[PDB]
Amino acid sequence: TMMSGRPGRVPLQFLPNEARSLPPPKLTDPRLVYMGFLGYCSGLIDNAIRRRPVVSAGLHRQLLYVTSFVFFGYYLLKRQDYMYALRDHDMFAYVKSHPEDFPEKDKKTYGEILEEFHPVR
Amino acid sequence: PFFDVQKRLGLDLDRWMTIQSAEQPHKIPGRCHAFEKEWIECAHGIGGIRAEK
Amino acid sequence: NVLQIVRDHWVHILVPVGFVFGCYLDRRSDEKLTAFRNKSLLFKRELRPNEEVTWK
Amino acid sequence: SSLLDLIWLETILPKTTSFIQMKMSIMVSNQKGLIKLYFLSFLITIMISMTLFN
Amino acid sequence: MLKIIIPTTMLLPMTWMSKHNMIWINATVHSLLISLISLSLLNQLGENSLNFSLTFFSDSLSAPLLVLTTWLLPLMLMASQSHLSKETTTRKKLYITMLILLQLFLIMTFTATELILFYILFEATLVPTLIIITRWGNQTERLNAGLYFLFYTLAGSLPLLVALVYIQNTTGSLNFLIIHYWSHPLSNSWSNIFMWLACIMAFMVKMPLYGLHLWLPKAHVEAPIAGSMVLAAVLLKLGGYGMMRITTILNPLTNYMAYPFLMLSMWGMIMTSSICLRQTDLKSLIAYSSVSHMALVIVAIMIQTPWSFMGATALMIAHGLTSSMLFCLANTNYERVHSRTMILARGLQTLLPLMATWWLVASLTNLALPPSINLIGELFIITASFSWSNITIILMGMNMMITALYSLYMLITTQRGKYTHHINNIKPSFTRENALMALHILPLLLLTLNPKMILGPLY
Amino acid sequence: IARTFYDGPEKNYEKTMAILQIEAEKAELRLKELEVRRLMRARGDGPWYQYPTIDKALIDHSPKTTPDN
Amino acid sequence: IRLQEDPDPEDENLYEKNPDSHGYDKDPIVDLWNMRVVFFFGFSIVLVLGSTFVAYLPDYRMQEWARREAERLVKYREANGLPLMESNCFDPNKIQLPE
Amino acid sequence: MNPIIYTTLIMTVMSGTMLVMISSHWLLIWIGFEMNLLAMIPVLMKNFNPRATEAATKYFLTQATASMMLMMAIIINLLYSGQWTITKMFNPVAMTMMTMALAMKLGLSPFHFWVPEVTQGISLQAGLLLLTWQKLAPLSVLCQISQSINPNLMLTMAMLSILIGGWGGLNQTQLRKIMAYSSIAHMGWMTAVLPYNTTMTILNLLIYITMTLAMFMLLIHSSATTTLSLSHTWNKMPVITSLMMVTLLSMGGLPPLSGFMPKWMIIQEMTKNESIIMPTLMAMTALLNLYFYMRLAYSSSLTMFPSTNNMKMKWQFEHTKQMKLLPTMIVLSTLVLPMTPALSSLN
Amino acid sequence: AKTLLHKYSDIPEGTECHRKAYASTSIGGATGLIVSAYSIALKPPASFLEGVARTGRYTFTSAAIGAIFGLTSCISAQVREKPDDPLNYFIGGCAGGLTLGARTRSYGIGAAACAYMGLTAALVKMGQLEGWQVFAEPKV
Ligand SMILES: CCCCCCCCCCCCCCCCCC(=O)OC[C@H](COP(=O)(O)OCCN)OC(=O)CCCCCCCCCCCCCCCCC
């Protein structure tokens, strides 16, 4: 386990207060659209299993499927973006704190670099 | 795996019984209370790897 | 019978509107890769008097 | 056609592997469901894990 | 590439919402429109590819394959119309959905810009093909054919996934542009040998390679007409495209590891042509001819010279079109007499003149009659192989002779001679079948007129 | 045809430059992340891989029954 | 016998119920319009229009540009007495050999 | 069984698992395991018959032995450390005993026979609950004690589980035994990835639970317990057969379905740690699982087996009971591959 | 098992062929004993004598395979004077496979065992040379 045990981690918290400094996902996000598509597919499968007209029966429950999937997907995307931002922040902090472990290397141009040539014949 | 409901809600379900240097009835000390206290105070807050090392 | 024609031949617009939407999405994706617009060594150019972007 | 394609190319990769998998499946699933037998197997596994694992 | 991707995902709901008697018409019309739209990808540059976005890009190698797929879909729809008359509406819509999903996956596979997405889509193409074969095949052996196909492909491709994730961890990215610009030589060690083996063996099993090819006759013989058309024309070219893409990071080790595969491919050309000489089934003959042509493409890719990649691309396109046409002709003959035996029906030139003409043209294109793109690709590959070594000319010459032999043998057996007396259900050829053959054959001659569009990025 | 259906080479050129920049940055970040993860797991002096230890707040410092606790 | 199975039906001939059949559908009108749309779209639109589009595709491969540049370079080289083709692709002054 | 008693026992099983997952004390974790087993036995013995009684007896014997081994490991760890908190165990022998006890509870090889035995003995709902919950809990314990796990022993048990599951599924014909061997193989995958990334372990757990729920609920809907019984479903409700086919394809790891995501992530994580041979063998061995999945799919969806005459009365009548969250579990088990980066949320 | 593997690896490759064969025979005997114990536990013998016979057959087969592999590999390496070559291990593995086929009286089993055992022995030698690890320690 990598992230668990991080200092300042409040248990059983889906979104801490520091996650509110990040841009919230746009409502037109392709991931949100895919979540809504999954909800619509679940509604169609529900109609098919229960032996109802697939594309015309249960419009209210299909709408509820889509809405629930979009809601949960939005919150899941917020948490995912927060976790990735936290990972990048920790990585950059450690790189700053350990310059001898992450040193800069000399940049030699290809004119100076010697590389072997392997003919194709 | 480990949903820390005790830490989240401020409960003491088993943390009283976790160690033998905690609050004992009638203030009865453990056999190795001093050694355990020193080990805990050394290893607290530095992580498992650093605590072992 | 005009409603019946629509009720039966409304599926013939799906592919055209999908093509239009795909072109729109391609343009919208191209607008996100403008980091080096008018900045390449080969095509760096002074803008015309009535012009703001070299390409869209 | 017959010797290479229909016989030996079929024998090397797909037929030999299929035969091996079938034999292993029979060996694995041929158990009689006897608690005494597979608890003795549990004991042997326990002893092996305790001794030859360091 | 979204302007091509989205219309297929709109073909799906259109197919599922169209009327029961309009599904074929709508699917064919809109597939033709999508092919016309996809024709715009042929306007490739000369130095670098067309980078639409971070996910999709088009190259001079990807564009002809995309055009071929988008053109091949409506022909498969016509063949499905032919052989699925008595099916129910829902099952017909499911068949069309399988074809549409396969086309969409192929388009995304050809336009993918990263190796892992390429692998995901290239493995995603397995499901629709397996479903089509094992569900709408006509004979008992379709289940065995599906099992062989699926397990050959997966046993080939899983080490490719392991190698790809290892390469990403080692280098940083699997993006094709990055792995081309940041390419470094591969040392001659056991680990590099096994990574080379993983990638190459995956694509060779997909290709297929001689000795790893039994799944091809098994699946092509037992598949329905649309499945055979897509298996031979496009799905066989995934291995060639992958090899032409994956060999960027395998040099110079490819100069040392290519010998076993080159010998296998050349002797496989010879052996499969000889097998074609003595086949009692027409579909098996066509399948083994496909194997021989793909072995020639393997030789070109392995020798890996600028004159060999152009020949490889041209031969891939030409073989796809020719094999699709041959399978369509064989399917028409089968649907007339309900048997795949070649010597069962004869005198078909006396009974059906126009089909005899189509057979003649298809067999002439199969044996690489100049100036067809089949011959263009074969001649480029032969010249590159001659530059590589001077006995490959002997092997190519004998392969070409046997190819002409079996092509004209099947032509003479099916079309010429005395008609079978007791076969009295040979109805005149349908306008649908004639149009299918014409739409197969005319693009070949047009590409002969303009050959620079299918010679790859090294032109 | 060029005016209607296509664009100039500058658009594709600079889009390719931007894509290359993004992909190179991502590859560098992936390598750096792998190095950071390896070092953190090896040492334990970073925010990651902080396995739990016994809390010191549980210790009772009140006088006991015997002076030698 | 082992099953209550239907006998294998005889294959239907489209020409029996419709001598003018194009082979697309058993419905005459649907068959006729399927043939018409296939022929029109495929042959006319795809073949003719795509063929002329590909024929008149702009020269983005820069073949003519390369020819003109080669002519210009050849003229400049042979006018000044310089070799037509240089010995090296890059500059040995900029290249630093290891020593 | 009274409905109130049944729901009380189900809630007791869930409360025991929750106590195991929230307790920081080894005694409390052992108490949770004991409560879980005690409340689980009647659930197995709900439908009373000699086979169910035998399955419950075997399950009780196995779980009691595992609990005794786990308590012995706890006591041994207490002897050398004097600590009750569940952390990295301070004694290798105690760690080995704990690992063996948890493997026995999970069903990892060579402790696997009771899994198909009990699964065949008990009904479909009992098997579903057994697999899901009784694998949910010990995996939580293992994830908590991951940093002290012996990689050699853990990976040996995982590979043995994968191989045994593949071969058993190849040879079996009963649907419940096929599901049991599938569970064994997936547990092998999870425990193979366990010593490197508990996040990947949890992701595999979630995907496996979703797919198993979908498959078991489809089997309950079709009321089929054998291959031939399932072979008649196409003549009554062909939609269920197609959904079962796509679920079987997903469980085999075929892209672009949801089942490929756990295998893909596990392969990536293991190859990050310079491990190639184990991921290669694990990937190649799943072909046996896919083979028996495909063989099961041939008999139900891709072909039409002969039917009977009373199936006409079956057509005349209609299914009454409605499964809960069946469409959601079907969708989540086949169409969540483009949502893979949510494993960061799972982290 | 670790001690036996350490002894086998500590014995030099191209030298001390008798000791290398002894180490391989010990490893094979241990494997055969474990297999015999599992076989008796899972499939009970009819009688004690039959169980002893089965254990002896399995142990002798495994020990013969190990001894043949060790002897063949060490002798090949010594005569070719080319250590660190997977071909020696391949020859030893095929020899062990042929020994198994002779013990089971089956030409097809012998051929398949030769092929598979030679391949896996070559893989083991390549892993020893290149530093491949089967059970990798958690690193990242
Ligand atoms: C890609 C193109 C295709 C490339 C690959 C083409 C195929 C190549 C391989 C062809 C097959 C070779 C033989 C493989 C199996 C050998 C074992 C075998 O066949 O066993 C079965 C049989 C059992 O016999 P049994 O039942 O006891 O009694 C009947 C008669 N006595 O056993 C017997 O009857 C035993 C008969 C043995 C006869 C001699 C066999 C010699 C050939 C095999 C060894 C070849 C070694 C090559 C080494 C090359 C090194 C570079």
UniProtKB/TrEMBL annotation, chain A:
<keyword id="KW-0830">Ubiquinone</keyword>
<keyword id="KW-0679">Respiratory chain</keyword>
<feature type="transmembrane region" description="Helical">
    <location>
        <begin position="61"/>
        <end position="77"/>
    </location>
</feature>
<keyword id="KW-0813">Transport</keyword>
<dbReference type="GO" id="GO:0032981">
    <property type="term" value="P:mitochondrial respiratory chain complex I assembly"/>
</dbReference>
<keyword id="KW-0249">Electron transport</keyword>
<comment type="similarity">
    <text>Belongs to the complex I NDUFC2 subunit family.</text>
</comment>
<keyword id="KW-0999">Mitochondrion inner membrane</keyword>
<keyword id="KW-0812">Transmembrane</keyword>
<keyword id="KW-0496">Mitochondrion</keyword>
<dbReference type="GO" id="GO:0045271">
    <property type="term" value="C:respiratory chain complex I"/>
</dbReference>
<keyword id="KW-0472">Membrane</keyword>
From TrEMBL, chain B:
<keyword id="KW-0813">Transport</keyword>
<keyword id="KW-0249">Electron transport</keyword>
<comment type="function">
    <text>Accessory subunit of the mitochondrial membrane respiratory chain NADH dehydrogenase (Complex I), that is believed not to be involved in catalysis. Complex I functions in the transfer of electrons from NADH to the respiratory chain. The immediate electron acceptor for the enzyme is believed to be ubiquinone.</text>
</comment>
<dbReference type="GO" id="GO:0045271">
    <property type="term" value="C:respiratory chain complex I"/>
</dbReference>
<keyword id="KW-0496">Mitochondrion</keyword>
<dbReference type="GO" id="GO:0032981">
    <property type="term" value="P:mitochondrial respiratory chain complex I assembly"/>
</dbReference>
<protein>
    <recommendedName>
        <fullName>NADH dehydrogenase [ubiquinone] iron-sulfur protein 5</fullName>
    </recommendedName>
</protein>
<keyword id="KW-0999">Mitochondrion inner membrane</keyword>
<dbReference type="GO" id="GO:0005743">
    <property type="term" value="C:mitochondrial inner membrane"/>
</dbReference>
<keyword id="KW-1015">Disulfide bond</keyword>
<keyword id="KW-0472">Membrane</keyword>
<comment type="subunit">
    <text>Mammalian complex I is composed of 45 different subunits. This is a component of the iron-sulfur (IP) fragment of the enzyme.</text>
</comment>
Automatic annotation (TrEMBL), chain D:
<feature type="transmembrane region" description="Helical">
    <location>
        <begin position="33"/>
        <end position="54"/>
    </location>
</feature>
<comment type="function">
    <text>Core subunit of the mitochondrial membrane respiratory chain NADH dehydrogenase (Complex I) which catalyzes electron transfer from NADH through the respiratory chain, using ubiquinone as an electron acceptor. Essential for the catalytic activity and assembly of complex I.</text>
</comment>
<protein>
    <recommendedName>
        <fullName>NADH-ubiquinone oxidoreductase chain 5</fullName>
    </recommendedName>
</protein>
<comment type="similarity">
    <text>Belongs to the complex I subunit 5 family.</text>
</comment>
UniProtKB/TrEMBL annotation, chain E:
<feature type="transmembrane region" description="Helical">
    <location>
        <begin position="433"/>
        <end position="449"/>
    </location>
</feature>
<feature type="transmembrane region" description="Helical">
    <location>
        <begin position="223"/>
        <end position="244"/>
    </location>
</feature>
<comment type="similarity">
    <text>Belongs to the complex I subunit 4 family.</text>
</comment>
<feature type="domain" description="NADH:quinone oxidoreductase/Mrp antiporter transmembrane">
    <location>
        <begin position="112"/>
        <end position="401"/>
    </location>
</feature>
<feature type="transmembrane region" description="Helical">
    <location>
        <begin position="21"/>
        <end position="41"/>
    </location>
</feature>
<keyword id="KW-0812">Transmembrane</keyword>
<dbReference type="InterPro" id="IPR003918">
    <property type="entry name" value="NADH_UbQ_OxRdtase"/>
</dbReference>
<feature type="transmembrane region" description="Helical">
    <location>
        <begin position="116"/>
        <end position="133"/>
    </location>
</feature>
<comment type="subunit">
    <text>Core subunit of respiratory chain NADH dehydrogenase (Complex I) which is composed of 45 different subunits.</text>
</comment>
<protein>
    <recommendedName>
        <fullName>NADH-ubiquinone oxidoreductase chain 4</fullName>
        <ecNumber>7.1.1.2</ecNumber>
    </recommendedName>
</protein>
<feature type="transmembrane region" description="Helical">
    <location>
        <begin position="284"/>
        <end position="303"/>
    </location>
</feature>
<keyword id="KW-0520">NAD</keyword>
